[PDB]
Design a protein around this nucleic acid. Structure first.
Lengths: 173, 205, 121, 157, 159
RNA sequence: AACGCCUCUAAGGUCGUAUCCGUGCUGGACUGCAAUGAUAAAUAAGGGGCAAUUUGCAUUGUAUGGCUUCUAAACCAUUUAAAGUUUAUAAUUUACUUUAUAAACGACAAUGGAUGUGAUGCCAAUGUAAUUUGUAACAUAGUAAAUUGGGAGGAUCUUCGAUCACCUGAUGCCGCGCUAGUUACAUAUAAAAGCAUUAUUUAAUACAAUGACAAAGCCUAGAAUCAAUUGUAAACGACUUUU
RNA sequence: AGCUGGUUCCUUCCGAAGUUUCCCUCAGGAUAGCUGGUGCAUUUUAAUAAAUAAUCUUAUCUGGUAAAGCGAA
RNA sequence: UUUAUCAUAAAAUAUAACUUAUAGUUUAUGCAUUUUAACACAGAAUAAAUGUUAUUAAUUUGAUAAAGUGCUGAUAGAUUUAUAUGAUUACAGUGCGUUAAUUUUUCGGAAUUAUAUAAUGGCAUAAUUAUCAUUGAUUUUUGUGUUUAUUAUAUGCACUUGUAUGAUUAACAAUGCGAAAGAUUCAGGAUACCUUCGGGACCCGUCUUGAAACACGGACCAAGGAG
């Protein structure tokens, strides 16, 4: 569930008589180098036949988030499978990570729709520049002059005393 | 009193959730911490007044038909409702569990010597911390009176009487506490046996 | 194994030897340069002069109680008193409390609500 | 940051006293430039020193396999796996009360109305600083929520 | 709005969870509800985003240019003399005290307790005539009133 | 309000069943518990009782190497998640209550053991101890030992409700203790043989309870049940009456 | 009596089948299969492979199910 | 990505003349002051605020792989009939008698450098052979030259509580005690059985697919009693 992004390429077997089968690639969200290949064939199958082990892997390579301190809005376009009911989504996530966005995605999808990690298909990734954010929740973050109340707290339990005689003390002023 | 740590922990049943408190207490009894739980009418259980009322009414439906006096004791009192919650969490069918129940004392409306005693908070049990905002909750003493607890009226008078003795002791305690701090502060600088130990401690007391 | 002295005169602990494992080795250091050193106190020295099974000699059909732990010996007293005296001079430099000079007397307190685990002794 | 951890980790060893290396600060705090390298922990409860106030409140069990040859021992001051790891090695004793003597001269002479069962502490049971213990006898389990007692002999430096 | 604590730009937060732990930090930018971009260059924590569940937010609010990279944060922090206010901060001195409540190699512990009994005598020994309660007395005397004037003045007396 | 609006509803709030649950009605926790009475045995005897006692001595727990403990004062009164703990000035109150101004621990890190919060301990002990320290000075802060009478008050399963306080007045004089600080003088324990000191792992002592041999120090002099008997009672015990 | 009931010490090691066929057979046998025991002949599958047995793969055959078809019989 | 720095867009976050309000208050329904998570990229301007191109920093940051590089704690085990009829052998340390030089301790000693032989890596050169493509690399094999490092051989004999010898637990030490018969003291034990604690234990025989069965025999015990 560990969200690492991987470039996988796969040609379809190698004959000397028979030249240079075409080279397809994908970006794959996987914790796993193996899951990177696993999803890669399944999505490759959807356009272009190519069953592993009439299938040639090629190279498995992990790709490098360009800006993990970078403060960006991503739109992901998503397909999920419901019980009687496969449908399409666009949702927008504000994350450090394209990796972090997807990880927050599988959790969010899982929750609301009952969203199966196996029942979810990714679709597409783009970084949203600039007011193309339909995103009512998202566009709240873009707002000049972003000060926001800290609402509530979170009470470590109890203490370094199991026995807290100094009463928490919901106050905080 | 004499214990692995304190053989009597007087616990304030105020703003504790009933099962959260019962479970942590059950552990303490098994560990040998011998606890007394006071103000079980001030004990809260989550889920609306009405929702609790119907849950609790479901058990009295349970009744050993042949001789119902063999049959399930539907314990009215908030102290006894707390007691049932702890007892179920303990293996009370074993002789070890009998020892553990004997370690436990449960009182509604804090009497005898327990009122000049400090009611300790268990912070896991705390309703305000654990329970989400805007969630309606029931108070056990309200629930108790619906299922037939006679003594709701009785304890409320006994608690008021207790609070009044507890008010006068507080007032004198706060007055005394002023006069103790000045009597340290004024002798402190006036030689050095208070300057030596306080500022060599220098932490933040 | 360890040679340990209280110093004797303060915290009532003799020229006494104890296991490396019995000991928590606290950060507090007394300058050990002044001493006559236990070059002179060796395994043999404190080895007991003697648990005879009885009255010196050789098979005298004896009697209940010699001195398995207790006289005491004069040689051993003299050895303590010299070493302890030099201990007292170094130890007096450090201020009173639990364990160096008038500091030494007191008998240890990790007091109730105090911690053998986060005591970085 | 793997390098930075390595540099940061030289520093507490330096302070200990010695082998004499790295300083690269660490706070013990005034410090001229450090709130840097962190406020303890902590995770407590007490005793500690003849005896950790300890509880025999269990045996090491399967769900319903009693397996008493090792015991669970809760050391009061040990919340954490780190703290209970201090106690890994220590000798334990349970001293308890008897009506009837038994044992005469070898060491002291105990009037054996007071009986002692001697044990050692072993490895760290708890996510929450309970520890395993082996005892030479093994503790009868009538000792449950009875205070058992752990002397700080054997402590490594 | 009385004012409870704002997740604001520059409201500061002393982040408990981290390799940061106990370092004082300032909120650069408000990310998402769960996170804030935080930079504390004078406490020497490098720039990172971190979760608002890892950090709990301070009283201290300094007019901050919100979106500042490390150099301008470091320039704005020593202009605020923020470190110096944070040492005055008596609850941070109390936070530096638990780094000292640690050990105090047991030698220093019985300093407290030997000498606490110096003060513990002197309390009971200062005690017992205001107005409040009553308060009193006209003894029954020659030692007892000369023990009350043995607070006060302290000549001639007993008995 | 959502849905500028509007609406029994989302939040909050009112009335409302032969229901339900008490009141009530019925068994009465076999011994769950309270209150109160007499508290024996009678003298050639002694017996019990206050025994919480007090002594030789014993038993047992505590602390177990003084003590390497411990604590029935004690962080409210709450709606409660912007909910909130307080101080002070100006008012206000029975109520940390009520009002305006200024701040403040802005559910941070803090805090949660101890402020041991009537500032405990492990102190007293100026050698702190399986001995106790004893004895001299200086100056500062400054300590107190005893008895009796009277007037009012308190008690929810609680270790003595024919008990324990508080206050006020009176009586005198054992001067019994003195402590902390600094400093003098002397010494037993401590030298526990052991160089591997933990191993079979202590107890002088301290505190709390219990004991009782012969003896000692105070107080007081029941009834139950069976027989016989009633019928209000009943198979028999038992119930209710009786001399 | 093909039925029911019972059958008398232990340990060690290996260890089933309710299937095939025929039988007035179908509450049972025989028979084959599964089971053990007894061994025997040779170990390049044996005592100080260029000989296999049987499972992948490969190479070389077979098939009318799944699917498909009905503007194919 | 980020630090440090340059140019451009550009200040879209903040700073910044000034414009406005509520309001405590002030002045006299309105004003002036100031405070206000109540105003306006509001002017020039500033921090390049963000984006983009360039340069970087002990080059970061993430991941993964690798070195007995160095090292600590704890846990359980430790058959040892090693001549029942089978091994005790191997190595290492230390001393012995080749020298020199430099260095450290500065005493005893210790290290490195100064040989021949063999192997190996690294440089250059040449041939083959396979390969990615030929700009250039990689592979297997072989030879040659140069220099350097590393490693092994040329290091025997005596002694040794040295390491292992393939289940290598003992140095070292304390304590109980075998104290004549007599008999103390220590350790150890689900004998019978009692106690205290936890956990587990449903009735056997049998036919039956399956038995604790609300299936059948068997109250209990002895002795006869069936491949």
């Amino acid at each position: 569930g560990l969200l690492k992004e991987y470039e996988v390429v796969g040609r379809k077997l190698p004959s000397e008589k028979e030249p240079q089968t075409p080279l397809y690639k994908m970006r794959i969200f996987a914790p796993d180098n193996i899951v990177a290949k696993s999803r890669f064939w399944y999505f490759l199958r959807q356009l272009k036949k190519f069953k592993k082990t009439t299938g040639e892997i090629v190279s498995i390579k992990q790709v490098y988030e360009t800006s993990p301190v970078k403060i960006k809005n991503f739109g992901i376009w998503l397909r999920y499978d419901s019980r009687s009911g496969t449908h399409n989504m666009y949702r927008e996530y504000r994350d450090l990570t394209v990796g972090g966005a997807v990880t927050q995605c599988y959790r969010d999808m899982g929750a609301r729709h009952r969203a199966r990690a196996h029942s979810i298909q990714i679709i597409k990734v783009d970084s949203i520049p600039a007011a193309k954010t339909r995103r009512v929740h998202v566009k709240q973050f873009h707002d000049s002059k972003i000060k926001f109340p800290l609402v509530q707290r979170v009470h470590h339990k109890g203490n370094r005393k199991l026995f807290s005689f100094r009463k928490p003390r919901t106050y905080f002023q | 009193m004499t214990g692995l740590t304190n053989r009597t922990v007087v616990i304030d049943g105020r703003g504790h959730l009933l099962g959260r408190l019962a479970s942590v207490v059950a552990k303490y009894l098994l560990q040998g911490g011998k606890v007394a739980v006071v103000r079980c009418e001030e004990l809260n259980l989550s889920g609306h007044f009405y929702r609790n009322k119907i849950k609790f009414l479901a058990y009295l439906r349970k009744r050993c038909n042949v001789n119902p006096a063999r049959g399930p004791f539907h314990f009215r009192a908030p102290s006894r409702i707390f007691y049932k919650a702890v007892r179920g969490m303990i293996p009370h069918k074993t002789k070890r569990g009998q020892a553990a129940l004997a370690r436990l004392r449960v009182f509604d409306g804090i009497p005898s010597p327990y009122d000049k005693r400090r009611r300790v908070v268990v912070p896991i049990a705390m309703r305000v911390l654990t329970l989400r905002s805007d969630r309606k909750y029931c108070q056990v003493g309200r629930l108790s009176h619906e299922v037939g607890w006679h003594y709701q009226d009785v304890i409320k008078s006994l608690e008021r009487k207790r609070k009044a003795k507890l008010r006068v002791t507080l007032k004198h305690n706060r007055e005394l506490k002023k006069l103790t701090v000045k009597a340290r502060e004024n002798i402190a600088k006036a030689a050095e046996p208070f300057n030596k130990i306080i500022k060599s401690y220098g932490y933040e007391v | 194994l360890l040679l340990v002295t209280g110093p004797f005169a303060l915290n009532s602990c003799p020229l006494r030897r104890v296991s490396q494992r019995y000991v928590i080795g606290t950060s507090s250091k007394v300058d050990l340069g002044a001493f006559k050193v236990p070059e002179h106190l060796n395994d043999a020295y404190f080895r007991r002069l003697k648990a005879k099974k009885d009255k010196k000699t050789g098979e005298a059909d004896i009697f209940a109680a010699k001195k398995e732990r207790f006289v005491p010996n004069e040689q051993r007293k003299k050895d303590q008193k010299e070493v302890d005296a030099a201990l007292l001079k170094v130890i007096k430099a450090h201020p009173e409390g639990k364990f160096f000079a008038k500091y030494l007397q007191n008998m240890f307190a990790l007091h109730s609500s105090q911690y053998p685990h986060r005591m970085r002794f | 940051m793997a390098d930075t951890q390595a540099k940061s980790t030289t520093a507490p060893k330096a302070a200990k006293a010695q082998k004499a290396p790295k300083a690269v600060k660490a706070p013990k705090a005034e410090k001229p430039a450090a709130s840097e390298a962190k406020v303890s922990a902590k995770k407590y409860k007490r005793h500690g020193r003849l005896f950790a106030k300890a509880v025999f409140t269990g045996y090491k069990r399967g769900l319903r396999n009693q397996h008493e040859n090792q015991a669970i021992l809760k050391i009061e001051g040990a919340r954490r796996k780190e703290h209970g790891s201090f106690y890994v090695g220590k000798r334990c004793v349970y001293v308890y009360k008897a009506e009837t003597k038994k044992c005469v001269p070898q060491h002291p002479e105990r009037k054996t109305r007071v009986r002692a069962v001697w044990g050692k502490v072993t490895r760290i049971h708890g996510n929450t600083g309970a520890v395993r213990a082996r005892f030479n006898r093994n503790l009868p389990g009538h000792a449950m929520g009875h205070r058992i007692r752990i002397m700080l002999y054997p402590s490594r430096i | 709005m009385p004012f409870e604590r704002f997740v604001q730009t520059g409201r500061i937060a002393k982040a408990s969870a981290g390799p940061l732990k106990g370092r004082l930090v300032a909120i650069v930018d408000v990310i998402d509800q769960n996170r804030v971009l935080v930079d504390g260059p004078l406490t020497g924590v490098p720039r990172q985003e971190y979760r608002l569940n890892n950090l709990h937010l301070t009283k201290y609010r300094i007019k901050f240019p919100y979106t500042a990279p490390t150099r301008i944060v470091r320039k704005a922090w020593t202009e605020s003399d923020l470190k110096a206010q944070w040492k005055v901060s008596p609850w941070s001195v109390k936070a530096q005290n638990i780094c000292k409540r640690s050990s105090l190699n047991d030698f220093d512990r019985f300093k407290l307790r030997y000498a606490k009994r110096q003060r513990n005598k002197l309390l009971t020994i200062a005690f017992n005539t205001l107005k409040k309660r009553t308060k009193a007395d006209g003894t029954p005397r020659v030692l007892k009133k000369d023990r009350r004037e043995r607070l006060r003045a302290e000549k001639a007396k007993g008995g």
